[PDB]
Amino acid sequence: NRVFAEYPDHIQDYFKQSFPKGYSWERSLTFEDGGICIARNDITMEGDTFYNKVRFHGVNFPANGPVMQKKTLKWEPSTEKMYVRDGVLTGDITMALLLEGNAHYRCDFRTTYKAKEKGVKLPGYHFVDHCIEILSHDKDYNKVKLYEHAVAHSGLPD
């Protein structure tokens, strides 16, 4: 939920401006070995609570790849490139999973963000640094504590 990102006053905050009605995002995760995932989240709000309805689908992961073999360790921090494509706010990212052995597993992200209410002003080209981490989890990952810190900016030199 990009609402959880520190936006500076000089950059239009499409996400915070999307509530109370809310917004929804769709994303394609294209991994370098052919594995591909699609996801979507419809985000609404009421009172002091955000409600998320999420769907996630993945296919074509190699039987002996790091995903099916559970050899990932974490996503490296990243910088999402935010811009408008054919009238729709889009975020492209060069993501990478750290693997056991210290090699990286690349994944290309493309997320499209759409406000429910019409007229929400679109922002100009900007950036959003990210850092997502699994703080803790039980043996088989049946229970996981997740955390994310995100900050928007205008890149160099500003």
Binding site: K16, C37, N52, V54, G58, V59, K71, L97, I132, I134
Partner: protein, 61 residues
């Protein structure tokens, strides 16, 4: 701000399928929107133990 409070609760439910494996995961957390931070406790309600890297799902919560 206004509509969004400095402190927000987070309710979530993810349903999915990876390489044929069905699963449902519930989430409950909180965050500080203006600080760009959030944390959540997730629990696999169906499909556990997941036969694939949990990491591929994290940015979708």
């Amino acid at each position: 701000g206004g509509a969004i409070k400095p402190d927000m609760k987070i309710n979530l439910r993810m349903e999915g399928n990876v390489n044929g494996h069905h699963f449902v995961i519930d989430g409950d957390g909180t965050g500080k929107p203006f600080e760009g931070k959030q944390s959540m406790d997730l629990e696999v309600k169906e499909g556990g133990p997941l036969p694939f890297a949990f990491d591929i799902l994290t940015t979708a919560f």
